[PDB]
Amino acid sequence: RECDYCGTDIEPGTGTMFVHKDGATTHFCSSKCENNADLGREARNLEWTDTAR
Amino acid sequence: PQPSRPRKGSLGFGPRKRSTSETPRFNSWPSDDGQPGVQGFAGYKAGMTHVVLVNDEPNSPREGMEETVPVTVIETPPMRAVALRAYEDTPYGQRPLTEVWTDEFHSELDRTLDVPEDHDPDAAEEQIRDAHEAGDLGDLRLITHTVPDAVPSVPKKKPDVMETRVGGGSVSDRLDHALDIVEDGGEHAMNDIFRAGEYADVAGVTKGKGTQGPVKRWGVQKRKGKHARQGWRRRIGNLGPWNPSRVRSTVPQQGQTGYHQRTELNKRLIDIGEGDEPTVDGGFVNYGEVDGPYTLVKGSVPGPDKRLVRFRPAVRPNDQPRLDPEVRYVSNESNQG
Amino acid sequence: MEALGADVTQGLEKGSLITCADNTGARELKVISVHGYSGTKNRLPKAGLGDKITVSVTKGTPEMRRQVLEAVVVRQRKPIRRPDGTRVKFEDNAAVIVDENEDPRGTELKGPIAREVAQRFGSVASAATMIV
RNA sequence: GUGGAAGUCUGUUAGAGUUGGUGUCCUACAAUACCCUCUCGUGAUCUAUGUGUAGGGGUGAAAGGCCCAUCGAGUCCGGCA
RNA sequence: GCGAAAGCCAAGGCCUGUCGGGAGCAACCAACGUUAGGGAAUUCGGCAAGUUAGUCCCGUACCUUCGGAAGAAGGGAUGCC
RNA sequence: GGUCUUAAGGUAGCGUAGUACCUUGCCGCAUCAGUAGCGGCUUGCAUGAAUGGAUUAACCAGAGCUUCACUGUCCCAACGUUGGGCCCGGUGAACUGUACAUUCCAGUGCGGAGUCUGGAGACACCCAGGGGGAAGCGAAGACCCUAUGGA
RNA sequence: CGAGUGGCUUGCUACCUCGAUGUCGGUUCCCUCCAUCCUGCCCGUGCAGAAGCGGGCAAGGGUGAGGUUGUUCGCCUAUUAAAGGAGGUCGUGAGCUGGGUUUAGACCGUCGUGAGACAGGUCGGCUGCUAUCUACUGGGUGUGUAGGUGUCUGACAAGAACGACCGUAUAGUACGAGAGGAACUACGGUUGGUGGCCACUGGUGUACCGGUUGUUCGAGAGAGCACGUGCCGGGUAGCCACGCCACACGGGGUAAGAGCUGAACGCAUCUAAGCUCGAAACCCACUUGGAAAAGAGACACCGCCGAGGUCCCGCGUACAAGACGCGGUCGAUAGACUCGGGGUGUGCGCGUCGAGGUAACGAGACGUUAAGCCCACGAGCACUAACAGACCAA
């Protein structure tokens, strides 16, 4: 599985899945990603992200 | 109305003092059943990682499915069963009678013992077999030691020495079995004793925390609300009633916490191998890299990384064995991060 | 009860106010008790995903308000752990009013439900639109 | 719109005070202190110096408050051993 | 900056709100920072802590001695170039 | 009762009150549940008109109650910061002390004993600790009574 | 109606204490009692079942959260297997609280000519001490047993180390007309308690990296101060719980109870002798301590001119002093350096762009740049430092 945020692969037996209000689903590999997302930042605008890269 | 409430902490692990031997000492051994065999082994704790296993439990709704399981990596290189001690039965319990030693000793066993230069293995054996003839022979055990040198992550070279009982068929047969091991050179491994999937009891001296107060040491409450601002935050209400006019040893007080021997029952052995498959990227934090004989124990094990841990076939297993669990993945992701 | 199939860290207590994810007419629910639970001195009774709880209606239609009813927790903000290690958390805390037989009193569920819950209360599941 | 009243409002301006913490202290820094919070701050305001009222007497927006760490009758010495 | 406010800095003064050395420096205490989910369940009592906050625009109830209530409430804005 | 003491016999109002013993009065509101609070009732143990009654905008570090918001008050505690604490150099008190004193369990005794009796336990010394006991230390009990005491 | 036990209520007495033994309630923390609320095992029933009701053994464990009220008590609510009662100076203020009671201020009702009074109501109203002894929790130094190392024994000691519940199969079965509706046993899970651990999730992280406000160092760069981070965002190690792991079966002897054989008393009789069974309770099993167990222990090897040990040195798996553990060139013990593994988020400088503006100037954007900065971790590596060396010892 890939992180629906930064793009990197999610180490099996790890990460969290956030279930949005409408039922959507976002798989995060770490708190760092969740926390940037919570700040309203978009992964493509963050240079360190695979997505961005 | 003064609601009930269990007491704070167990009264069965005391006194809560510093352990006398850092090397754990079992106070019980498995029962005698199968062919003779050493009833224990030892290794050094390295760290933890996780693995993904195929569910074994034939009574589980998830049988045959992926399951992530925490694992503690223990380096378990070969040990040397260096001697055979015999115990005789006496009106005052079991007492050491004699020992049968060898000739080949690891190059550094002399960092702990005064290795034998002149010994007579036959007079000793004779005395032992005579004791068996007389019927005054108590259990049989092997003087065993580890080879720290084979473990780079562990600084020590001074071997750790422990006695491990030999159980098995008939005494005559295991007595012979014991002598065999010893005489060789004593070299034996984790395989010779355990098989992946079996349950072992692990013993170790817990991580030390020096002096700690009742809240941390015994799990008593902290003062609450307004009671926490008057000058007392982490002190118990009182040391006892007016009478008896003395403080009972049962009231939670400050003192040594940690560095106590503990025997953790029924730890499932997930995998016994050798190499660097379980090792972690960057190296296990505060330990080093694993590349050699190792054992993956399910869950946690007492003690800090590098401490000597001891294994023994579980003496009170709750479940039946499900040998060689299928490991589909062993995490090697860095433990820093 | 039947094994849930996941590890839960109760994210609610007696008195917590939560969303009523159905069309019964109740908008907000207050937790009064947790079925089968028995705690310890000074411990506030806690409830989480999969628990059946007694509730009182705090917000909703006049007819529903103040009624004391049974419900099932279907979503919570505090994470839960699935057999594969992944944690799962929702956008809010929600429950569905249920009757003596555990059948949803309402006719439609609102928002997603946890697969673990659906499996324990099938009739509640056979009313869900999304099951995460 | 002008005007700029007020025992008027906000305000750690100066300055005055002291609701709560029943915090700190409680052989104290201190025989009444420390910190935060809090109240007043153009007036029956606050403040310095000078000056007057004296003990069954003063003074008192009155609490038996105050009259030099003491007041339901000051202090000193005497009556007095 | 509204400011004799805060904060920072000059002129000027000081290192004397006058015992030092050492241990990643433990328990415990005094001040204090950060705490997931729940959110007053705590307690005699929201005690303690927190929340809100400056300025501009919109807008503002009951009641009223018509002065007031009122910054009621509630909503929006706020930098740099 | 349908007057009598002792002059009159409680009017407007308010009322279970900072006054109501009974009392958590009864009805209602609000809460999952409210000896609270508010509204109503009211025969008021024992309200009531300058011993002022009623009422009331504004004001209040005044008493009680509810709600929104918020939060480590709590569930249930954790980690961290500064100063102490701990070890070292120097400086260097006080409180307290009939004696003896390593105590514990029972009993006894002026009936609430480290010291008496019977048992049990107990090798000496030292460090840190939180304070069970010494009916701990501090103050010739402010309560109560007594005194042919004081004010 | 009669006979008792307790010392939880109240009263009585005035034996102890007035050169003082600080009230109630609550809180915190520990031990106990049984007249048992639940849980285990039983007996009876107006016992079909399910369930009630009554009784017996039994104190291992549990007995919880909330609303009024200072309340104890009690009333009330939803949960629960059940939400038992009582003793410990009505346990617990040299532990906390200070709401009630019970000083000085004040009000009301009633009483009193009045001062004033009233287990009537009401608002406000102070909680000192550096532990000498003893007690206990932990940590040391000595002596005794009587050269050293390593391994043990186990007298004794502690434990609740485990208690309870839900669900599934049994089974819509037995039972019952039906309604309703079990059990043995085997399983899965939850809860309370317990011990440990950090791969996972979460918290912290005044290491670190970044953003940014005011001000000062002329600007820039780079910095100080704004309380022990100015504020905000992220977060490594470590520590933690909200995270994760582990916490019996089986024996032995009994109680109540069910019986066998069995006589006194030819019969009968579970009892008098004997015996078979039978509780969460008792003992063992399991965990933890434990040679100072004065009968002061056992074994093996080493050594008495030398085994072993101390000082010293580099360090932590340890740690308040002390103690403990490891390494010391026969070496990777610590540091430097370089890789690896991590944190942050794209450096300075320069070049292009940039709303505009004659120009000067210009917030900011892109590129260089997965950049720059940083690391309590790992590996490699004797480069530096574990050197030199002093001493005890049958």
Ligand SMILES: [Cl-]
């Ligand atoms: Cl407390």
Ligand SMILES: [Cl-]
């Ligand atoms: Cl509840």
Ligand SMILES: [K+]
């Ligand atoms: K007295």
Ligand SMILES: [Mg+2]
């Ligand atoms: Mg990590």
Ligand SMILES: [Mg+2]
């Ligand atoms: Mg990670």
Ligand SMILES: [Mg+2]
């Ligand atoms: Mg409580």
Ligand SMILES: [Mg+2]
């Ligand atoms: Mg003057």
Ligand SMILES: [Mg+2]
């Ligand atoms: Mg929090």
Ligand SMILES: [Mg+2]
């Ligand atoms: Mg409460």
Ligand SMILES: [Mg+2]
């Ligand atoms: Mg406050």
Ligand SMILES: [Mg+2]
């Ligand atoms: Mg009323």
Ligand SMILES: [Mg+2]
């Ligand atoms: Mg009149």
Ligand SMILES: [Mg+2]
């Ligand atoms: Mg006197």
Ligand SMILES: [Mg+2]
């Ligand atoms: Mg008096």
Ligand SMILES: [Mg+2]
């Ligand atoms: Mg007089």
Ligand SMILES: [Mg+2]
């Ligand atoms: Mg008397």
